[PDB]
mmCIF file of C-alpha atoms in Angstrom:
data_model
loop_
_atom_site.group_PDB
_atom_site.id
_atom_site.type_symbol
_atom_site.label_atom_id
_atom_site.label_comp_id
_atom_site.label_asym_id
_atom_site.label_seq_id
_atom_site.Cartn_x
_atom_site.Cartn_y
_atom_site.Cartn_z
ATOM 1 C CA UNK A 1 -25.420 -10.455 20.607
ATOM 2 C CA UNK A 2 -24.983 -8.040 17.477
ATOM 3 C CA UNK A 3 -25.990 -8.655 14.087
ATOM 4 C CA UNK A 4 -23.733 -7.719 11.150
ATOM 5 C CA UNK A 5 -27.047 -6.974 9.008
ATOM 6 C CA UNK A 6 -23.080 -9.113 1.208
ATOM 7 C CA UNK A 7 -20.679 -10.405 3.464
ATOM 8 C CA UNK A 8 -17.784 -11.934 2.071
ATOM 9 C CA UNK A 9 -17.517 -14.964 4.127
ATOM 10 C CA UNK A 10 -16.057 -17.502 0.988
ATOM 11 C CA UNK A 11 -13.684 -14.252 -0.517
ATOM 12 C CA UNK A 12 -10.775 -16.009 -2.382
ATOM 13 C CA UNK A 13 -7.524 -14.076 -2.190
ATOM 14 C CA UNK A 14 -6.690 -11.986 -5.557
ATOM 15 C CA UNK A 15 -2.885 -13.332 -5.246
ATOM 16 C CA UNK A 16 -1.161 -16.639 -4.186
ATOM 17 C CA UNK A 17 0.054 -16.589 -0.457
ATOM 18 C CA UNK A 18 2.019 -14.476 1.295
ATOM 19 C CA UNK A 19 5.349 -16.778 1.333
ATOM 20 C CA UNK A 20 4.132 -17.153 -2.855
ATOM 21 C CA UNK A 21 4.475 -13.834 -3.844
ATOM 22 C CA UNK A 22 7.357 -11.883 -5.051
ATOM 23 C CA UNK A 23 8.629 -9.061 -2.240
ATOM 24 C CA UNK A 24 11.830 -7.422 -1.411
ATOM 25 C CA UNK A 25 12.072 -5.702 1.796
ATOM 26 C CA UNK A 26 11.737 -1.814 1.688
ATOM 27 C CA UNK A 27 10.326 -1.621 -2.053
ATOM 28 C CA UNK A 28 6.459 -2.161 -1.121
ATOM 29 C CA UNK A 29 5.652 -0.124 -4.399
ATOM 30 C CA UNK A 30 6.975 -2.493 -6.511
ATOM 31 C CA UNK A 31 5.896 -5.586 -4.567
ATOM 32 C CA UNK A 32 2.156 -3.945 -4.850
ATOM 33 C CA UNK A 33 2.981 -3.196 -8.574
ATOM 34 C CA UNK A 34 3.939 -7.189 -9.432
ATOM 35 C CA UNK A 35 0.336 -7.615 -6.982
ATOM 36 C CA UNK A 36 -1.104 -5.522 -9.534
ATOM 37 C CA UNK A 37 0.069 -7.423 -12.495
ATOM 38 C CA UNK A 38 -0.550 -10.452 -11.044
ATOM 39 C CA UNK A 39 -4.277 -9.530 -10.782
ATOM 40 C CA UNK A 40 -4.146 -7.797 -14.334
ATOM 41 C CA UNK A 41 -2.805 -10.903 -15.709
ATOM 42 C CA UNK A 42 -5.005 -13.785 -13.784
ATOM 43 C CA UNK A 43 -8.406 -12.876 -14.961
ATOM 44 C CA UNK A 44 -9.760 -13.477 -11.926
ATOM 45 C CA UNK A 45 -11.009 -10.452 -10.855
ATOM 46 C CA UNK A 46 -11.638 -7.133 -12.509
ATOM 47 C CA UNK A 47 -8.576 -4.700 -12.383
ATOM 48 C CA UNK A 48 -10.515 -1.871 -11.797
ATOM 49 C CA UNK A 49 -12.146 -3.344 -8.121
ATOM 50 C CA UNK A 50 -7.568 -2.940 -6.784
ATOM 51 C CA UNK A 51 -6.089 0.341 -5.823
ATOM 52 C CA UNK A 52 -2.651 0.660 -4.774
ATOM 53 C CA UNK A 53 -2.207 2.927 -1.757
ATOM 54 C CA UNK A 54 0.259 5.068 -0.813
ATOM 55 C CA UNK A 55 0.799 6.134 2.876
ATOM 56 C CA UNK A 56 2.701 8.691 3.982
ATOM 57 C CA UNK A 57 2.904 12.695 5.022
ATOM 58 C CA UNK A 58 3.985 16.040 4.708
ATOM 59 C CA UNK A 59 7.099 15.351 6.825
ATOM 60 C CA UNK A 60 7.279 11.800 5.442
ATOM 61 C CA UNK A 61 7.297 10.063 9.212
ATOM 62 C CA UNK A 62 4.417 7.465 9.628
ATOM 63 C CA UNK A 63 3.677 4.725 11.837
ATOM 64 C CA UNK A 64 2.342 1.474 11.258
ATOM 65 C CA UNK A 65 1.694 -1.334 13.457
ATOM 66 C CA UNK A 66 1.970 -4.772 12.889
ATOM 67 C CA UNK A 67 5.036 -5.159 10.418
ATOM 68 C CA UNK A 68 6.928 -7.894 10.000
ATOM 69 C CA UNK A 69 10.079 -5.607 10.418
ATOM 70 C CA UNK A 70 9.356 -4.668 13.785
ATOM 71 C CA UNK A 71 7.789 -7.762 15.808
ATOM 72 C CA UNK A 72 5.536 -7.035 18.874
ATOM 73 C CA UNK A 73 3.122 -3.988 19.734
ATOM 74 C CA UNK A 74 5.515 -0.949 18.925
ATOM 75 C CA UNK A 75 5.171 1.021 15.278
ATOM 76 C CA UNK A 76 7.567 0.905 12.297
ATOM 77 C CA UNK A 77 8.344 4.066 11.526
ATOM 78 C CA UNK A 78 8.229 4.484 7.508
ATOM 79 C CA UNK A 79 8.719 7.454 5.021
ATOM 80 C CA UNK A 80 5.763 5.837 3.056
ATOM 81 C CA UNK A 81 4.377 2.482 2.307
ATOM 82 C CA UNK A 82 2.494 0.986 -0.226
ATOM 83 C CA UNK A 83 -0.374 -1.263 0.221
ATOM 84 C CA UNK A 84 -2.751 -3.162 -2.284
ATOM 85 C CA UNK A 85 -6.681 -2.781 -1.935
ATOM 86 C CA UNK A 86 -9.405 -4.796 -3.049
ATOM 87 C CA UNK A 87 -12.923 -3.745 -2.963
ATOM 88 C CA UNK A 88 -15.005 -6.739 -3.607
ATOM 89 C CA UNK A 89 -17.570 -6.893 -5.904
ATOM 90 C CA UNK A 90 -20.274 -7.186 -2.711
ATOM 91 C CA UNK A 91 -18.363 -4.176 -1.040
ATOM 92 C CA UNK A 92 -16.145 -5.778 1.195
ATOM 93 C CA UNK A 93 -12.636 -4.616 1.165
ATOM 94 C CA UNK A 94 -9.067 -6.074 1.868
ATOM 95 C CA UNK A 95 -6.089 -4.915 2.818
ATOM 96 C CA UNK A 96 -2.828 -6.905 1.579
ATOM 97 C CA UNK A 97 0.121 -5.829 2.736
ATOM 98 C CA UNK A 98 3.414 -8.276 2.365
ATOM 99 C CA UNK A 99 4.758 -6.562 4.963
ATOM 100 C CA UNK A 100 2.406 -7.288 8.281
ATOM 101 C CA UNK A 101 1.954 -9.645 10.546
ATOM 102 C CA UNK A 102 -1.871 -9.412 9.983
ATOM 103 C CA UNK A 103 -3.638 -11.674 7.668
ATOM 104 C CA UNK A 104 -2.867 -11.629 4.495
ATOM 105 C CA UNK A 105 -5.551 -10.445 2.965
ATOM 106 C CA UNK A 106 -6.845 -8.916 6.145
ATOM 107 C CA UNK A 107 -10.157 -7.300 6.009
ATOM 108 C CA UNK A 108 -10.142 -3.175 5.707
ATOM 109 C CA UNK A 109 -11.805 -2.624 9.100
ATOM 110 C CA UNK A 110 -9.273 -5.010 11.011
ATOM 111 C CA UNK A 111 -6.295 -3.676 8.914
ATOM 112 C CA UNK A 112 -7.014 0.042 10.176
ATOM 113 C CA UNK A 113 -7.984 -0.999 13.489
ATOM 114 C CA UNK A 114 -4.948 -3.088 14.513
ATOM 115 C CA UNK A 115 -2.286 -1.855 11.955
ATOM 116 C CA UNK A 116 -3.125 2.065 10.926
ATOM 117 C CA UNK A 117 -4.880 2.834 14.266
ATOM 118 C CA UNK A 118 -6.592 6.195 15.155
ATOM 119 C CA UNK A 119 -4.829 9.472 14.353
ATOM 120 C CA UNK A 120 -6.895 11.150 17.216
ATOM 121 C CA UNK A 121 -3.755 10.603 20.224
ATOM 122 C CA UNK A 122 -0.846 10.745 17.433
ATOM 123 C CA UNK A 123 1.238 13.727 17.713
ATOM 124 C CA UNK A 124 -0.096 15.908 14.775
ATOM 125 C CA UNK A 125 2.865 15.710 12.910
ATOM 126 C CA UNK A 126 2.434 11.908 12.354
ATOM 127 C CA UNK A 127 -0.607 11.375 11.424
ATOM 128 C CA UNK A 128 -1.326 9.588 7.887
ATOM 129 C CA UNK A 129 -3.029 10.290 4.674
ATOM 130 C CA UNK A 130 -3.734 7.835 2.294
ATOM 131 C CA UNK A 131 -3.168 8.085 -1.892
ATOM 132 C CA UNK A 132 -5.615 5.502 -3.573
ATOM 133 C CA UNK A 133 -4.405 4.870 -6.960
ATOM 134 C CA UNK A 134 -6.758 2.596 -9.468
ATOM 135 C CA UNK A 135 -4.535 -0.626 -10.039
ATOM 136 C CA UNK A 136 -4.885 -0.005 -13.634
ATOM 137 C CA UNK A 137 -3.242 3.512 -13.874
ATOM 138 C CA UNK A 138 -0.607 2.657 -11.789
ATOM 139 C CA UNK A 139 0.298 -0.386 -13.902
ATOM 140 C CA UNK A 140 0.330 2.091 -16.545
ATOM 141 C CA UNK A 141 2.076 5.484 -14.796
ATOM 142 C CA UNK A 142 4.526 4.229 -11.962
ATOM 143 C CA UNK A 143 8.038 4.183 -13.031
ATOM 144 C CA UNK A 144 10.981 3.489 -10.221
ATOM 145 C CA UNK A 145 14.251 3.782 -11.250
ATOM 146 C CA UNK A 146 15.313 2.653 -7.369
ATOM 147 C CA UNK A 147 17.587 5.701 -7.306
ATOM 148 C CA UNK A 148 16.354 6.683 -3.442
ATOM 149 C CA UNK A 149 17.784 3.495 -2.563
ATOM 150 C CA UNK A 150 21.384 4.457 -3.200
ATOM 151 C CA UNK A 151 23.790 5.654 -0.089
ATOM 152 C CA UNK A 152 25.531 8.820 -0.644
ATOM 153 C CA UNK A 153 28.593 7.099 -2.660
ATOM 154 C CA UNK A 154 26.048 5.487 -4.731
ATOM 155 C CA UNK A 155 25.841 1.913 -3.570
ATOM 156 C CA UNK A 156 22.775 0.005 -2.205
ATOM 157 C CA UNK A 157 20.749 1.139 1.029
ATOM 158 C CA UNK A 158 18.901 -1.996 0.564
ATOM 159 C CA UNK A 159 19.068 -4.683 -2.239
ATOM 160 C CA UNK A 160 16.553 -4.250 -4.961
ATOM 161 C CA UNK A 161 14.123 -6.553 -6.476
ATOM 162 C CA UNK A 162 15.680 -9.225 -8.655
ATOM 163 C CA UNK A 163 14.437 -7.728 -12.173
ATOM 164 C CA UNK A 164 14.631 -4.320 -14.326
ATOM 165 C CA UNK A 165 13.378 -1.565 -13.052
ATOM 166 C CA UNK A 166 9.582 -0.236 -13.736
ATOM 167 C CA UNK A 167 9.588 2.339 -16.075
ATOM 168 C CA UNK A 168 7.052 3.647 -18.851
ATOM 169 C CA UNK A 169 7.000 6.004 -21.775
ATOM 170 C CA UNK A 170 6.775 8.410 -19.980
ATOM 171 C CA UNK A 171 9.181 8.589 -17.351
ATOM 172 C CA UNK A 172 12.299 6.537 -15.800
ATOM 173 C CA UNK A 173 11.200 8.233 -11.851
ATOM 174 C CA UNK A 174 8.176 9.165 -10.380
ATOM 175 C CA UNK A 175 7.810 8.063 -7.178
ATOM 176 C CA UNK A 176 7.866 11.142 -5.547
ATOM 177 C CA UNK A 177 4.745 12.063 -6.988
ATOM 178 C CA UNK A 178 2.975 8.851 -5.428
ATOM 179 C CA UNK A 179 4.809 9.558 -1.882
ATOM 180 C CA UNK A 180 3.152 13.238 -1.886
ATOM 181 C CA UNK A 181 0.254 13.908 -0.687
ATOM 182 C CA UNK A 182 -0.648 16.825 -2.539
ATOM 183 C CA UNK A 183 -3.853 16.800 -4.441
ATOM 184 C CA UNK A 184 -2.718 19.013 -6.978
ATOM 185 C CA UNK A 185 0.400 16.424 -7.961
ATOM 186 C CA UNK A 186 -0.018 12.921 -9.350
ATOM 187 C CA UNK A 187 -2.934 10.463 -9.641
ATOM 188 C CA UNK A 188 -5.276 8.823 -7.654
ATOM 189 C CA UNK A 189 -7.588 10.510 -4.788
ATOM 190 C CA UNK A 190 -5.945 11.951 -1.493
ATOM 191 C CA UNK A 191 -7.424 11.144 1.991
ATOM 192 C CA UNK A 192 -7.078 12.002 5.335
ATOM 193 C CA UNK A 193 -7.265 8.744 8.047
ATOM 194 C CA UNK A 194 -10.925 9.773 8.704
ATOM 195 C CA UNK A 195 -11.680 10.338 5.057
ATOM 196 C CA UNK A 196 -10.534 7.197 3.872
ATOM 197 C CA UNK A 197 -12.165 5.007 6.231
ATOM 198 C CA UNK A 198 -15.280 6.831 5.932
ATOM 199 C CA UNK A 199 -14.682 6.082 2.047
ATOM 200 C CA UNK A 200 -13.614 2.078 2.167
ATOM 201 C CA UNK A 201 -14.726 0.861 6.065
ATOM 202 C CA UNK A 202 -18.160 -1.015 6.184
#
Protein backbone atom coordinates (compact mmCIF):
# COMPACT_ATOMS: atom_id res chain seq x y z
CA UNK A 1 0.00 0.00 0.00
CA UNK A 2 0.88 3.80 -0.76
CA UNK A 3 -0.35 6.71 0.95
CA UNK A 4 -1.40 9.84 -0.98
CA UNK A 5 -0.15 12.03 2.14
CA UNK A 6 -6.09 18.61 0.56
CA UNK A 7 -7.42 16.09 -1.55
CA UNK A 8 -10.33 16.90 -3.43
CA UNK A 9 -12.37 13.89 -2.92
CA UNK A 10 -16.15 15.92 -2.83
CA UNK A 11 -14.79 18.56 -5.93
CA UNK A 12 -18.06 19.73 -7.66
CA UNK A 13 -17.62 20.33 -11.38
CA UNK A 14 -17.25 24.24 -12.34
CA UNK A 15 -19.81 23.55 -15.40
CA UNK A 16 -22.99 21.40 -15.96
CA UNK A 17 -22.21 17.98 -17.71
CA UNK A 18 -20.60 17.16 -20.56
CA UNK A 19 -23.89 16.37 -22.80
CA UNK A 20 -25.09 20.10 -20.86
CA UNK A 21 -22.70 22.24 -22.21
CA UNK A 22 -22.56 24.14 -25.36
CA UNK A 23 -19.72 22.58 -28.01
CA UNK A 24 -19.31 22.48 -31.67
CA UNK A 25 -16.89 20.13 -33.04
CA UNK A 26 -13.45 21.64 -34.12
CA UNK A 27 -13.95 25.16 -32.28
CA UNK A 28 -12.58 24.00 -28.69
CA UNK A 29 -11.58 27.78 -28.14
CA UNK A 30 -14.82 28.91 -28.15
CA UNK A 31 -16.42 25.95 -26.37
CA UNK A 32 -13.62 26.72 -23.48
CA UNK A 33 -14.52 30.48 -23.90
CA UNK A 34 -18.60 29.85 -23.19
CA UNK A 35 -16.75 27.33 -20.13
CA UNK A 36 -15.21 30.43 -19.15
CA UNK A 37 -18.27 32.52 -19.05
CA UNK A 38 -20.15 30.06 -17.63
CA UNK A 39 -17.80 30.06 -14.58
CA UNK A 40 -17.52 34.00 -14.75
CA UNK A 41 -21.17 34.18 -14.63
CA UNK A 42 -22.14 31.29 -11.89
CA UNK A 43 -20.40 32.63 -8.90
CA UNK A 44 -19.39 29.56 -7.94
CA UNK A 45 -15.95 29.63 -8.06
CA UNK A 46 -13.39 32.37 -8.41
CA UNK A 47 -12.47 33.21 -12.12
CA UNK A 48 -9.09 33.65 -11.46
CA UNK A 49 -8.51 29.65 -10.03
CA UNK A 50 -9.54 28.66 -14.60
CA UNK A 51 -6.99 28.99 -17.30
CA UNK A 52 -7.74 28.22 -20.74
CA UNK A 53 -4.98 26.24 -22.46
CA UNK A 54 -3.82 26.20 -25.65
CA UNK A 55 -1.91 23.17 -27.14
CA UNK A 56 -0.11 23.11 -29.99
CA UNK A 57 3.59 23.61 -31.79
CA UNK A 58 5.93 25.14 -33.94
CA UNK A 59 4.79 23.00 -36.90
CA UNK A 60 1.22 22.99 -35.56
CA UNK A 61 0.95 18.85 -35.57
CA UNK A 62 0.00 17.45 -32.05
CA UNK A 63 -1.34 14.38 -30.75
CA UNK A 64 -3.79 13.70 -28.25
CA UNK A 65 -5.23 10.62 -27.01
CA UNK A 66 -8.48 9.90 -25.93
CA UNK A 67 -10.83 12.13 -28.20
CA UNK A 68 -14.06 11.57 -28.88
CA UNK A 69 -13.21 12.09 -32.66
CA UNK A 70 -11.02 9.28 -32.89
CA UNK A 71 -12.40 6.23 -30.67
CA UNK A 72 -9.88 3.59 -29.37
CA UNK A 73 -6.03 3.84 -28.39
CA UNK A 74 -4.63 5.76 -31.55
CA UNK A 75 -3.99 9.86 -31.35
CA UNK A 76 -6.01 12.65 -33.02
CA UNK A 77 -3.86 14.54 -34.74
CA UNK A 78 -4.76 18.43 -34.13
CA UNK A 79 -3.21 21.84 -35.24
CA UNK A 80 -4.07 23.01 -31.62
CA UNK A 81 -6.65 22.45 -29.01
CA UNK A 82 -8.01 24.22 -26.33
CA UNK A 83 -8.66 22.92 -22.96
CA UNK A 84 -10.17 24.50 -19.68
CA UNK A 85 -8.17 24.22 -16.27
CA UNK A 86 -9.19 24.46 -12.86
CA UNK A 87 -6.86 24.68 -10.02
CA UNK A 88 -8.82 24.14 -6.92
CA UNK A 89 -8.69 26.17 -4.13
CA UNK A 90 -6.83 23.02 -2.07
CA UNK A 91 -4.46 22.61 -5.19
CA UNK A 92 -5.98 20.00 -7.01
CA UNK A 93 -6.38 20.53 -10.65
CA UNK A 94 -8.82 19.43 -13.51
CA UNK A 95 -8.69 19.04 -16.82
CA UNK A 96 -12.09 19.54 -18.89
CA UNK A 97 -11.96 18.93 -22.18
CA UNK A 98 -15.49 18.46 -24.26
CA UNK A 99 -13.70 16.69 -26.54
CA UNK A 100 -12.31 13.29 -24.66
CA UNK A 101 -13.42 10.31 -23.77
CA UNK A 102 -11.89 10.83 -20.25
CA UNK A 103 -13.88 12.12 -17.43
CA UNK A 104 -15.18 15.11 -17.63
CA UNK A 105 -13.60 16.90 -15.34
CA UNK A 106 -10.74 14.46 -15.23
CA UNK A 107 -8.09 15.10 -12.75
CA UNK A 108 -4.65 16.88 -14.20
CA UNK A 109 -2.41 13.89 -13.43
CA UNK A 110 -4.84 11.30 -15.21
CA UNK A 111 -5.56 13.81 -18.08
CA UNK A 112 -1.67 13.97 -18.97
CA UNK A 113 -1.10 10.48 -18.25
CA UNK A 114 -3.76 8.84 -20.45
CA UNK A 115 -4.59 11.73 -22.92
CA UNK A 116 -1.23 14.10 -23.39
CA UNK A 117 1.21 11.23 -22.61
CA UNK A 118 5.07 11.58 -22.40
CA UNK A 119 6.92 13.57 -25.07
CA UNK A 120 10.11 11.46 -24.25
CA UNK A 121 9.38 8.54 -27.43
CA UNK A 122 7.44 11.25 -29.69
CA UNK A 123 9.27 12.13 -32.72
CA UNK A 124 10.71 15.63 -31.80
CA UNK A 125 8.76 17.36 -34.14
CA UNK A 126 5.49 16.48 -32.28
CA UNK A 127 5.93 17.08 -29.15
CA UNK A 128 3.53 19.71 -27.26
CA UNK A 129 3.76 22.92 -25.42
CA UNK A 130 1.15 24.22 -23.50
CA UNK A 131 -0.22 28.22 -23.42
CA UNK A 132 -2.02 28.79 -19.97
CA UNK A 133 -4.14 31.74 -20.29
CA UNK A 134 -5.98 33.19 -16.90
CA UNK A 135 -9.81 32.60 -17.68
CA UNK A 136 -10.31 36.17 -16.99
CA UNK A 137 -8.02 37.71 -19.73
CA UNK A 138 -9.12 35.52 -22.19
CA UNK A 139 -12.78 36.40 -21.57
CA UNK A 140 -11.52 39.77 -22.06
CA UNK A 141 -8.73 39.41 -25.17
CA UNK A 142 -9.86 36.38 -27.44
CA UNK A 143 -11.64 37.44 -30.47
CA UNK A 144 -12.48 34.64 -33.38
CA UNK A 145 -13.86 35.78 -36.32
CA UNK A 146 -13.98 31.78 -37.53
CA UNK A 147 -12.25 32.89 -40.72
CA UNK A 148 -9.66 29.62 -40.58
CA UNK A 149 -12.67 27.67 -40.89
CA UNK A 150 -13.48 28.70 -44.44
CA UNK A 151 -12.39 26.29 -47.59
CA UNK A 152 -10.54 28.01 -50.24
CA UNK A 153 -13.89 29.33 -52.10
CA UNK A 154 -14.94 30.61 -48.84
CA UNK A 155 -17.55 28.22 -47.55
CA UNK A 156 -17.53 26.18 -44.27
CA UNK A 157 -14.70 23.54 -43.35
CA UNK A 158 -16.81 22.79 -40.45
CA UNK A 159 -20.10 24.42 -39.17
CA UNK A 160 -19.62 27.05 -36.57
CA UNK A 161 -21.13 27.57 -33.26
CA UNK A 162 -24.75 28.66 -33.36
CA UNK A 163 -24.12 32.45 -32.19
CA UNK A 164 -21.97 35.70 -33.24
CA UNK A 165 -18.69 35.49 -33.29
CA UNK A 166 -16.27 36.52 -30.18
CA UNK A 167 -14.82 39.64 -30.73
CA UNK A 168 -13.60 42.64 -28.41
CA UNK A 169 -12.51 46.22 -28.74
CA UNK A 170 -9.77 45.42 -29.69
CA UNK A 171 -9.71 43.09 -32.40
CA UNK A 172 -12.20 40.97 -34.77
CA UNK A 173 -9.02 37.89 -35.03
CA UNK A 174 -6.55 36.79 -32.83
CA UNK A 175 -6.31 33.40 -32.62
CA UNK A 176 -3.15 33.00 -34.05
CA UNK A 177 -1.60 34.60 -31.28
CA UNK A 178 -3.15 31.94 -28.75
CA UNK A 179 -2.11 28.94 -31.28
CA UNK A 180 1.70 30.24 -31.08
CA UNK A 181 3.82 29.30 -28.86
CA UNK A 182 6.08 32.07 -28.78
CA UNK A 183 6.70 33.75 -25.52
CA UNK A 184 7.33 36.95 -26.94
CA UNK A 185 3.55 37.00 -28.71
CA UNK A 186 0.26 37.00 -26.83
CA UNK A 187 -0.80 36.31 -23.22
CA UNK A 188 -0.63 33.81 -20.80
CA UNK A 189 2.67 31.70 -19.76
CA UNK A 190 4.33 29.19 -22.33
CA UNK A 191 5.36 25.62 -21.25
CA UNK A 192 7.05 22.83 -22.43
CA UNK A 193 5.21 19.11 -21.53
CA UNK A 194 7.75 18.79 -18.65
CA UNK A 195 7.35 22.37 -17.56
CA UNK A 196 3.81 22.36 -17.28
CA UNK A 197 3.34 19.33 -15.38
CA UNK A 198 6.05 20.20 -13.13
CA UNK A 199 3.90 23.56 -12.77
CA UNK A 200 0.08 22.01 -12.33
CA UNK A 201 0.74 17.91 -11.51
CA UNK A 202 0.53 17.04 -7.70
Amino acid sequence: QHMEGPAAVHYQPASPPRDACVYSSCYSEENVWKLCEYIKNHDQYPLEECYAVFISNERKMIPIWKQQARPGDGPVIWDYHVVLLHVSSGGQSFIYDLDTVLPFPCLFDTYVEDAIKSDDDIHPQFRRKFRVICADSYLKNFASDRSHMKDSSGNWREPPPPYPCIETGDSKMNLNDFISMDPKVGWGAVYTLSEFTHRFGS
